[PDB]
Structure formats: C-alpha cells, structure tokens
Amino acid sequence: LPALKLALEYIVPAMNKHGICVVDDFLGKETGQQIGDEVRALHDTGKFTDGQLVSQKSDSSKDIRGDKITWIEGKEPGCETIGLLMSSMDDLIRHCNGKLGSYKINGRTKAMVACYPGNGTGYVRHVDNPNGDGRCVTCIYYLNKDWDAKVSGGILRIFPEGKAQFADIEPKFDRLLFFWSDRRNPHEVQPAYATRYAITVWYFDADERAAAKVKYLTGEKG
C-alpha cells in the first residue's frame, strides 16, 4: 500500500503498542524473487564473511552467531533490486516522521545481507543495541520460500520486555519485520537446518548515534 498509509495506519501503531510489526508480502513475488537471486549471486562470489560482534569476548564469533554476511550500499552493479528494497524501507521510515517513539531517525546502516548456511547454526539470544550505539529500529526482509519451521527450524524468537510470552517469526519469503533494537526486544535465531537468507538495516537516532561515535574513541573513565 502507499508508504504513508502503511506507516501511519499500521507500522506506527504496531510499533508504539508492541514494539514489533510484521508486513507480509511487502514487495510481491516478482521483486522478492529478483532480490533473492541477487543475494544468491552475491553468496556465490564467495565474498561473504563470518558475522561479527560489537565486542567479541568469546573464543570465536561462531559460538555466538553462525551466519555469513556482507554489506551492500544498494548502488553496486548487480544489487539494483536490493537498492529498491532499501529505498522502500527508507520511504516507510521517512513517512513515520517522529511518531516512532521519541526518536529522531536521520540515518541508517548499510544493508547486512546474511545467510545461515543451514547446518544447524543460528544466533543465540541477544540485544541488537544493549548499550546505546544509536540503533533505534531493526528492519529485516526475509527471502525464504515455503519455509516450514517444524522441518527447517530457523525461527526468530523475540521476547518483548515484561510480556510473559515470546513471539515466533518465521523467516518467510517477502516478509518485512520491524522491531525496537534496544533491550525491549531480546531475540534469537533458532538453529536453521536449511539455507536461510535475510536482509537487515538498522536505523539510527540522531542524538544517540552522535554520542555513540564519541564513546568509542575514548569513553573517558569512572
């Protein structure tokens, strides 16, 4: 639907009420397929790398997350449809104005194209932005056709703060997902027994991000 109607009439309410919003059939089967093909070509270049952590303390990153990823701006040759995806997400966000909590969203990361090879690997329970690095909204587009979690696993399980029941999001094809990045939404990728693709972008809050960039260099002491 019109970015404006989806934003104001669905995304904004869902996000402020529950901190999670799912929009299925975001771009349609044709575009979704084109995106999937671009991701599979990118994977077939062999340029993917192990997913990394903000501050790794574990033996290896593989103990935490078991995916292979790359970062795309959306202007690279062969990624035009991923670019269309990123510009559509941006469209929705711009149309959310300052109605998504009290954040002033002025920027975002590049797209993280991610692949769980399907060998029983996933991502343990975690928070995307526990200690305030600017990330206020997580946006994930899934690409996996006829995915059956009872067979292939790979559920994204979110545990919204305070609620006694978690939520299981299947990584369905053409599904769009929004949720607060901070400690409100601890989540986990359960073991995936099949190749599981997803595209993520993190949107930033101006003030938080600006502070996050200075805290890295020094952080002073106390």
Binding site: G51, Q52, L53, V54, S55, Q56, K57, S58, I64, R65, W71, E73, D90, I93, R94, I105, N106, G107, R108, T109, K110, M112, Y123, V124, R125, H126, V127, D128, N129, P130, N131, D133, R135, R183, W202, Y203, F204, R209, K213, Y216
Partner: peptide
Amino acid sequence: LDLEMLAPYIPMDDDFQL
C-alpha cells in the same frame, strides 16, 4: 550475561543519511 559480546557488529563509519 554480557550483552555487549553478543550484539551484532555495525561499522562505526559509513552511516547513510536519510
């Protein structure tokens, strides 16, 4: 539970302005 060591990495540079 140290969340910092579990959080997915993002670059510090190369943000995209909206």
